[PDB]
Swiss-Prot record, chains A, B, C, D:
Keywords, comma-separated and alphabetical: Acetylation, Cytoplasm, Folate-binding, Methyltransferase, Phosphoprotein, S-adenosyl-L-methionine, Transferase
Residues binding (6S)-5-methyl-5,6,7,8-tetrahydrofolate 2, per UniProt: 174, 199
Subcellular location: Cytoplasm
Gene3D superfamilies the UniProt entry points to: Glycine N-methyltransferase, chain A, domain 1, Vaccinia Virus protein VP39
Superkingdom of origin organism: Eukaryota
Quaternary state and interactors: Homotetramer.
Example GO biological process: one-carbon metabolic process
Name of the molecule in the record: Glycine N-methyltransferase
Enzyme Commission number(s) from the entry: 2.1.1.20
Organism of origin: Rattus norvegicus
Function: Catalyzes the methylation of glycine by using S-adenosylmethionine (AdoMet) to form N-methylglycine (sarcosine) with the concomitant production of S-adenosylhomocysteine (AdoHcy), a reaction regulated by the binding of 5-methyltetrahydrofolate. Possible crucial role in the regulation of tissue concentration of AdoMet and of metabolism of methionine.
C-alpha cells in the first residue's frame, strides 16, 4: 500500500535513520524496498523457508549495487544479540507486520516476550527507533472473531474466509488461531475456483500490555508513541485501528 | 455428599421406580448404591478402563445376591439404542456426574448432542424419570476456571490441582479442557506421596441451552425441574450452584 | 490340541500340582481350562483388553463353583513379585502360547529378560513346575518369514495374511514384527469380506539362548526339559519343531 | 579425496564434458570444485537446508565470475524432469556420494527407484555420462555390519562408533540404518570429549540390482561400467571395495 510505504520511509527519514536492522525479514518485502530507497539494510529472520525467498530476489537483483549491499542472516529474538553484531546500534530496528504476534508464550510466564524484545530493542542505537507493530487484539478479543480484508499494509487481491478460534488459559488470552479458507480463482471445472486453506496462530497482545512490554525493554530510557492504523492513537477515539504501531526512540 | 444420596433415593421411591438404567456407570458409584438400595440396576458406560472397576466391585460382592443381578455393559449415548434394548423402557434413567458434558461438539452445531440426549430419553418408559446433570458453566465461563475438590455428588478423598483452559470458536465457548494433577497418598519416598495427572475436556453447557436441549429429546410430553446443587432453583438467585440436576418425568 | 491338553493336564496331575498360576491368562483359554478340570488357578495378565475377555467367562460361568474361585488380576512379569504375592509358592506356573516372546529387549542387554524370567520362577514352590514356551525362532531365523495358522493349541478359523519385518542390530537379531492382515468374510456388499490388519511384535529366541536364560531364572535348582513341539526334542533331529516347550522342575 | 578428485576431473575431462548437472548438490562440495575446475555447473538438491549452504558459498564468492555462473536450485529426482529443463541434455551428470541410497521404497516395489534413475538418466545427452554411486551394501548385508572409517570419498578425521541396523520385510532387505555415535574431541570434564549419536537410513542397494536398475532407465542404450573404489572392479577380486561407482555413456 502506497500509504504504508510512504509512512515508513518518511519516518525513517524524519529521524535521520539510515542504517536499519529488520528482525522479521520474512520474504524481504519491506527490507527490499528500504534497500531501494537507499538504506543500509541488514535483514534477518529465523525461518529459512521464508529467508530463502528474500535471498532469491537479491541474487537476481544482484546486478545492482543497492542489492549487493544488503544482508540476510537467520536469527531469533530469543538470542538476537548472539546472532546479530549490534556494533554501536542500528539507526532504526523495524519489526512491522504483526511479526511479534508469532512469538507464542511457551513458559506461561511472558518471560519469552520480555527476552525477545530485550534483544530486539537492544540493537537500536541512542536516539534510535523501533517500529514494532501488532494487530488490534484488544478488539479481536472483544469481538470474538478476526475481521480480515483490510490490510492497511497491503491491498490484498485474494479473498479467503477466516475462522477465528481464541483460547483462554486460566482466564488470560493465550492465543488466537486464524483459519484461512482461501478461495483460489480458478480450480474447478468450467472455470470455477478451488478451495485451499491454511492456518496460523499468534498471541492476542493488547495495547495496554504491549505498551508496558515495549518500554520495559528499553530499560525505560526511551520515547514511546503509538499510532492507530497509521495515525496517532487517542484512547476512546471514534476510530478503530486495524493495526497498532508502536515506535520507540531509544534515548538511553 | 451423603445428602445427595437421600434426596435421589426418595424421588426414585416416591415415584415407584425399580428398574434404573445408568447411562454412565463410571466406576459404579451410583449404580452400586441403587444396587444395595434394592434396585434392578442396569448400568452401562462407554469406557473399558472405567467399567473395569465397577465390574470388580461386582465380583467381590458377587456373593451378595443383590450384586449378582447388577449389570454393567459397554455402550455409547451416540448409539445407546442399538446397544441397549429397553423392552418397554425403564423406570429411572440416571446420567449423574457431569458425564454428559464429555460429549464434544465435533460437527460444530449441536447435532451430536441431539442424538445423545435424544437416545437417552428413549430409555425412559412413559411416566419415567431421568437425572442428567451438568456443571454450572454459566458461572464457570465468567470465572474462566473450574473450582475442584467438592462435588455434592459424593466425597472422594483425592486432592487435586487443576488448570482450566477454555476455548472460544467464533465467540462461542466451544470446549473447556481441564488439566488435573491428583495427589497419590503414597508415591514419594519416606511416606512422601506421588503426583500423577491427566486431562479431560468438556462442553460448556449453559443451563439455558441444556433445558431446551433436554426437553427437546422428550419431544415435549414431559416434566422438567432443574435444582441447583439439589434444592430448588429459580433464576437470578442469591445462591450459586456448582451442578445443575435435571429431573424429568417423560409423560408421552 | 487335545493331545497337548492331555499332556499338560497329565504333567500337572502327574506331579501332583493343584495350585497353578497362569502368567499369561490372555483371553484366558488355557486358564479357563485348568479351572474346569478341578484345578485351583489364579490367572494374571498384563493387558486389560485381553484379560477382561476372560473376566467375562467368569461372571457368565460364575454359576459354577469352579469359576467362583477362579482368579484374574492384571500383572507384569517385570513387577510380578510386587503384583502377585507368591506366599509359600505355587505348585505349577505356566507360560504357554509364545507369550513371553512379547517382552522386548529395550535395554539392549537381556537384563529385562532376566528380570522377567526371574520374577516368574519366583512363583514356583520347591519341587515346582514352569511351562514357558517360545516359537521355533531358530528356523524362522534361516527362513526370514513366519507361516501363520500353525498353532498347535486352538483351531484358528480367521483367515489372515502376515508380513515379517526382522530387525537385526549389529548382526544380532533384535526384533520380529508380524503385521497381521486379517480378513472379515462378512465385511462387504454381497457377502464379500473386507480386509485390514493389526500389529504384533516379538523378540526372537533360539533354543540355546533361552534354554540357558531360563534355567538361570532358577539358578541351577531345576530339572529343565524342552519338547520339540509337544514331543521329545533332539538336537540334529528330523522333525523340525515349531513351538519349543520348556518344562521346569525347580529343585532347590 | 586426493584420489577421488583426481580420477573425476580426468574422467569427466577425457569424455569432454563441460556442463554438468549435480542431482545431489548437498552442501555443494563437488559442485564448488567443478566450478573452480572450470566447468559449466548447474547443481541442485532436494533439500533446502543442504542447498542453502551451497548457496551461501556462492554468494561470498559471488564476486569471482566463476561462481557467478554457478546454478544451485531445488529439485527432487522423483520429478527431476518437470524440475530441470533438460534442454539439449547435460554432458556429465554426477550423483556421487551415496546420495541415491537415500531415496526409500515406500511403495514396496522399487518403482520409485527405477523412476528416479530414469528421470536422472533423462538429464544425460547422447554420448552422455552418468556418475551414480552407492555403498557396497552387498558386504554390509552379507556381514550384518557396516564398517566405519573407510570413506574413500574423504578421509574422515572423526571418531564415532557405528551400529548397523538391517531391517527385513518378507525376506527382502528393506532398509539399513547406521547409528554413528560420533565423539566430540572435547565434551568431557578434564579436557575430555563428549558423545552424541546420529543415525541415518539408506536403501541397501546391491551391485547386481543397481547395475540392472541403472541401465534400465537408459533402455539398454548406453555403456555401463562400475569401479571398485576408483579402479577396475572384477567379481571375486580379493579386494572388498566400499563405494561402487557406476558410469554411463548414454549412447542413444
Ligand atoms: N522468534 C522469532 N524471531 C525472529 N523471527 C521470527 C521469530 N519467530 C518468527 N519469526 C519469523 O518471522 C517471519 C514471520 S513475519 C510475517 C510478516 C511478514 N514479515 C510480512 O512482511 O508480511 C517468519 O519468517 C518467521 O520465521
Ligand atoms: N459419549 C459417551 N458415552 C458413554 N459414556 C461416556 C461418554 N462420554 C463420557 N462417558 C463416560 O463418562 C464416565 C464417567 S464421567 C467422567 C468422570 C470419571 N469417571 C472420573 O472418575 O473422574 C466415563 O466412564 C466415560 O467413559
Ligand atoms: N510384560 C508382560 N507381563 C504380563 N503379560 C504380558 C506381558 N507382555 C505381554 N503380556 C501379555 O501376553 C498375553 C497373551 S499372548 C496370547 C495369549 C493367548 N490367549 C494364548 O493362547 O495363551 C497378552 O494378553 C499380553 O497382554
Ligand atoms: N530424494 C532426493 N532428491 C534430491 N536430493 C536428495 C534426495 N534425497 C536426499 N537428497 C539430498 O542429498 C544430500 C545427502 S547425500 C550427501 C552426503 C555426502 N557423502 C556428504 O557426506 O557430504 C542431502 O542434500 C539430501 O537432501
Amino acid at each position: 500500500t502506497a500509504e504504508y510505504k510512504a509512512w515508513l520511509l518518511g519516518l525513517l527519514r524524519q529521524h535521520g535513520c539510515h542504517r536499519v536492522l529488520d528482525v522479521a525479514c520474512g520474504t524481504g518485502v519491506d527490507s527490499i524496498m528500504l534497500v531501494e530507497e537507499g538504506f543500509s539494510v541488514t535483514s534477518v529472520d529465523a525461518s529459512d523457508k521464508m529467508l530463502k525467498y528474500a535471498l532469491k530476489e537479491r541474487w537476481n537483483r544482484r546486478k545492482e549495487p543497492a542489492f549487493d549491499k544488503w544482508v540476510i542472516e537467520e536469527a531469533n529474538w530469543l538470542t538476537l544479540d548472539k546472532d546479530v553484531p549490534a556494533g554501536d546500534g542500528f539507526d532504526a530496528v523495524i519489526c512491522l507486520g504483526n511479526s511479534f504476534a508469532h512469538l507464542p508464550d511457551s513458559k506461561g510466564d511472558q518471560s519469552e516476550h520480555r527476552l525477545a524484545l530485550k534483544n530486539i530493542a537492544s540493537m537500536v542505537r541512542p536516539g534510535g527507533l523501533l517500529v514494532i507493530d501488532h494487530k488490534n487484539y484488544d478488539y479481536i478479543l472483544s469481538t470474538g472473531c478476526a475481521p480480515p480484508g483490510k490490510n492497511i499494509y497491503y491491498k490484498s487481491d485474494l479473498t479467503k474466509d477466516i475462522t477465528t478460534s481464541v483460547l483462554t488459559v486460566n482466564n488470560k488470552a493465550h492465543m488466537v488461531t486464524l483459519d484461512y479458507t482461501v478461495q483460489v480463482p480458478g480450480a474447478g471445472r468450467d472455470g470455477a475456483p478451488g478451495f485451499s486453506k491454511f492456518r496460523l496462530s499468534y498471541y492476542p497482545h493488547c495495547l495496554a500490555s504491549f505498551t508496558e512490554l515495549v518500554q520495559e525493554a528499553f530499560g525505560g530510557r526511551c520515547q514511546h508513541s503509538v499510532l492507530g492504523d497509521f495515525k496517532p492513537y487517542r484512547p476512546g477515539q471514534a476510530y478503530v485501528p486495524c493495526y497498532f504501531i508502536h515506535v520507540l526512540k531509544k534515548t538511553g
